Design a protein around this ligand. Structure first.
Ligand SMILES: *Cc1cc2c(nc3c(=O)[nH]c(=O)nc-3n2C[C@H](O)[C@H](O)[C@H](O)COP(=O)(O)OP(=O)(O)OC[C@H]2O[C@@H](n3cnc4c(N)ncnc43)[C@H](O)[C@@H]2O)c(*)c1C
Ligand code: NA
Ligand code: NA
Length: 490
């Protein structure tokens, strides 16, 4: 009652939604990307606030502190467990939803931009393009992902070998802390500014906007997508790829998608067919690439082409707030430091990817720039020595069809354990997986011991510094969820 009362004093009421409000279901559902989490059995927010100004965010936080109602912040809503808009167990929370704060201001000459957290990646990329055809930013591949969560958790895509992760190309932020105070880099200090750029969403406050450096790309890039069935020698080719791809020049990224006994090699090359063809011949002739495979286009055109296979619909693919694709979905991830034996590739392609409920596996090679940053330089620790990341993706489309996919996801994670990283078994924070572990709350504070179980998997040796920073900026654990950094205080 009095939390809502506090909000109405400071924030335009058209931006406030209670469960009884007629628009509440629409506002709640607008950026839910996973049908597992939209159904009525999920725990719902007591209130939703859709700020349009930074002062609205500050007022919401001050009200939540005064009346002890916690806030989950949502930008693009892609959280794999939905923790930006649901809780796992019954509890009271408000959602602060940033979708209306979506400005992108590009300074093409300075090669910098200010980007609101509620902007989607496609909108960031398109705004950069409206300014220059030869500037880029290295974040995710999916245009509807929100800037807020993508940058907070790291963020990587087809430029990761050239330029590393999104978070290490951030040069300032505008942030509201757990006391409602407005911060930038200078007022936050080294620890807090280090933590917020890759240490995971929610934990370190609400980032309102990010200042980024914009990076050069040539006017023409080249994409290919070359598939090999097991009959065409997929196992021998991918067994070579895992050693070669992490060692290729920074200008060339070759990722793999597999969903059966067949591997599709997708390359982004910062250059032309003319130079790519000989490079492939010299370094990876086993793939059988030739000039007919090349698709030359601008960097901006490469974003819908890689993600959707589209060449012809730039605005529609990058400026898209319809929220049409809502699979039921499960996700896991791994990091690989040692080459798989050929027999493991045999098993993955011929056996694991031909089971009931089998999903899709995506393999991103590291090396080059992402691996040159020291492990502790940012909170993202998956750097030197990483050959490739694996994402295990399961989609299904009817409510009662979950059992086989969920079982496959668990079974293949168990199968892969001996061949992937261990002690800890590393995972990417933005591929959130609650089965890696969740927090325990004691005296209303997330415990350090419970955070450490999953926290070492996402952040390896950076977890303790994250928790000590959390203790300094949010000792009462105001901004939290079931898998957020717990405070470690003296
Ligand atoms: C759905 C989806 C996700 C993808 C896709 N492809 C990716 C890619 O190519 N590269 C990646 O690095 N990641 C990819 N992912 C995963 C996404 O990066 C993550 O799912 C992001 O965390 C999603 O961010 P966003 O869309 O903003 O999701 P939310 O659910 O709103 O938030 C996630 C998380 O972060 C907190 N949070 C949100 N907003 C803020 C701000 N402004 N400040 C601090 N913290 C924030 C939330 O509370 C929540 O905890 C491809 C697809 C299709
Ligand atoms: Na290890
Ligand atoms: Na999950």
């Amino acid at each position: 009652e009095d939390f809502l009362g506090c909000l109405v004093k400071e924030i335009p009421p058209r931006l406030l939604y209670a469960k009884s409000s007629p628009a509440y279901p629409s506002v709640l559902g607008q950026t839910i990307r996973n049908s597992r989490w939209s159904s009525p059995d999920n725990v719902k927010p007591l209130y939703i606030i859709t700020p349009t100004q930074v002062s609205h965010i500050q007022s919401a936080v001050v009200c939540g502190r005064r009346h002890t109602v916690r806030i989950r912040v949502r930008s693009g809503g892609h959280d794999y467990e939905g923790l930006s808009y649901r809780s796992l167990q019954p509890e009271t929370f408000a959602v602060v939803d940033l979708n209306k704060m979506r400005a992108v201001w590009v300074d093409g000459k300075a090669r910098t931009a200010w980007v609101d957290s509620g902007a989607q990646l496609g909108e960031l990329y398109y705004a950069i393009y409206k300014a220059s055809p030869t500037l880029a930013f290295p974040a995710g591949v999916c245009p509807t992902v929100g800037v807020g969560g993508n940058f907070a958790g790291g963020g990587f895509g087809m430029l990761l070998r050239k330029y590393g992760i999104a978070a290490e190309n951030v040069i300032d932020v505008k942030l509201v802390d757990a006391n409602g105070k407005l911060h930038d880099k200078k007022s936050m200090g080294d620890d807090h500014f280090w933590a917020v750029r890759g240490g995971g969403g929610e934990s370190f406050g609400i980032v309102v906007a990010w200042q980024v450096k914009l990076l050069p790309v040539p006017p023409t890039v080249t994409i290919f997508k070359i598939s090999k069935t097991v009959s065409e020698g997929a196992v021998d080719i991918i067994n070579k790829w895992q050693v070669v791809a992490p060692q290729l020049p920074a200008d060339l990224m070759i990722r793999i998608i597999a969903q059966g006994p067949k591997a599709t090699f997708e390359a982004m090359y910062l250059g032309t067919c003319k130079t790519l063809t000989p490079l492939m011949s010299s370094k990876f002739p086993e793939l059988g690439m030739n000039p007919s495979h090349c698709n030359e286009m601008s960097w901006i055109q490469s974003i819908p082409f890689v993600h959707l296979g589209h060449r012809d619909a730039l605005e529609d693919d990058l400026l898209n707030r319809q929220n049409s694709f809502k699979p039921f979905a499960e996700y896991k991830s791994d990091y690989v430091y040692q080459p798989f034996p050929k027999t493991v590739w045999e098993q993955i392609l011929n056996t694991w990817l031909v089971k009931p409920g089998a999903g899709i596996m995506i393999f991103d090679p590291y090396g080059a720039t992402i691996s040159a940053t020291p492990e502790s330089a940012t909170p993202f620790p998956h750097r030197k020595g990483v050959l490739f990341n694996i994402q295990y993706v399961n989609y299904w489309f009817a409510p009662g069809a979950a059992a086989a996919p969920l079982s496959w996801s668990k079974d293949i994670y168990n199968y892969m354990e001996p061949y992937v990283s261990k002690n800890p078994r590393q995972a990417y924070a933005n591929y959130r997986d609650i089965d890696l572990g969740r927090n325990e709350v004691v005296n209303d504070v997330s415990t350090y011991a419970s955070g450490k179980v999953w926290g070492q998997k996402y952040f390896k040796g950076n977890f303790e510094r994250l928790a000590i920073t959390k203790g300094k900026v949010d000792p009462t654990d105001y901004f939290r969820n079931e898998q957020s950094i717990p405070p470690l205080i003296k």
